[PDB]
Design a protein around this ligand. Structure first.
Ligand SMILES: O=C(/C=C/c1ccc(Sc2ccccc2OC[C@H]2CC[C@@H](C(=O)O)CC2)c(C(F)(F)F)c1C(F)(F)F)N1CCOCC1
Ligand SMILES: O=C(/C=C/c1ccc(Sc2ccccc2OC[C@H]2CC[C@@H](C(=O)O)CC2)c(C(F)(F)F)c1C(F)(F)F)N1CCOCC1
Lengths: 182, 182
């Protein structure tokens, strides 16, 4: 039925300007494609700290991804993935910020680095979690494995390793082939 | 996996010019929303006779509903629904027209009247059939019932009756809420 979806995007220092924008363009592509549906969106940038760039209430008032993401500034710091998953779950998935109690919860994590913090993601056990690991930092099997503990299972379904930020376009192509009425 | 979908739309004399236009506009609204997906479309006008206005191969090459339908002329005759469905099954879902033999076949039938011919639609048994009945001709339970034999079962899932042609907007709104990735 209803799907409240949060994009949790990396704003670490490793990300070049163009790579950071390709993340934004990807999220905007998706949101545009799925306007006027049972989907509701929010977005949070995570580096060292966390910022709700816009929440569910904001999406419903605007329904305009371009406008909604126009204040994003690249944090340019670390990659605190654990703290960021917990921040989404405790501070973003809230009825007080437009979330629908009924809805299927989905989290899309987009990163170019291994996490710099630690802990657990117990607060997010009730959320379907996908993670996109992009670039050279994820060349090895071991690097790719570290990303599993953040995502739902199996990794074959919920973990996607992309070789470049151009490949975000290919992923948008792939997903659209999975868009169906019903 | 792939979905091959035909719009089989009514061009009977009973349709006023604006009503005919609104069917054309509904079809374009749907296709535009499902662009760049696993859906490929064909459109076929039926009254007394039948015409393929564009085929699947036209859609793949142009991906432009506006242009693909720009040359439709309202037939202004009868409503031979039986022969029309039969024309779709045997003449439209063909490699020659860009049909993928392995795909899921969908037929959307849009009509404002009861069928003027008879016979059977046994040739369309492999096709998932939806029928939209529009207007005052479908005021009675009885008249809406006459459409059941053309649609997949049950009628509650595959038959929709609309009071007016303006209500095509409302069906467009409803259907988009049923759009999902997966
Ligand atoms: O809405 C979704 C998921 C959407 C979704 C999922 C992943 C993703 S991205 C993703 C991340 C990790 C692995 C795969 C992924 O997608 C592969 C494609 C093709 C395969 C599909 C599948 O595994 O069924 C997924 C898409 C997205 C995204 F990113 F587009 F935004 C989206 C988004 F675009 F929609 F948001 N549902 C419904 C609830 O159940 C889960 C799927
Ligand atoms: O692609 C489709 C059907 C789409 C489709 C279906 C009906 C319809 S129109 C329709 C006609 C008769 C009854 C209902 C109908 O829609 C209810 C909505 C909401 C309920 C949904 C559901 O019961 O799953 C269907 C849509 C359409 C249409 F018209 F938009 F073009 C479309 C179209 F827009 F997509 F083409 N699939 C996926 C494969 O399995 C069959 C359904």
């Amino acid at each position: 039925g209803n799907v409240d979806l949060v994009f949790l995007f990396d704003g670490s220092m490793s990300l070049q300007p163009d790579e950071f924008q390709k993340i934004l363009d990807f999220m905007k592509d998706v949101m545009k494609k799925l306007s006027n549906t049972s989907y509701q969106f929010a977005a949070v940038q995570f580096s060292t700290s966390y910022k709700t760039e816009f929440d569910f209430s904001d999406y419903v008032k605007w329904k305009d991804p371009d406008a909604l993401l126009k204040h994003v500034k690249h944090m340019l710091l670390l990659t605190n993935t654990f703290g960021a998953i917990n921040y989404v779950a405790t501070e973003v998935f809230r009825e007080e910020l437009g979330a629908r109690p009924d809805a299927t919860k989905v989290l899309i994590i987009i990163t170019d680095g291994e996490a710099t913090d630690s802990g657990n993601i117990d607060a997010a056990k009730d959320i379907i979690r996908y993670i996109i690991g992009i670039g050279k930092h994820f060349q090895t099997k071991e690097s790719q494995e570290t990303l599993h503990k953040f995502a739902s299972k199996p990794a074959s379904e919920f973990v996607k390793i992309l070789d470049t930020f151009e490949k975000l376009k290919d992923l948008f192509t792939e997903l659209q082939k999975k868009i169906y009425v019903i």
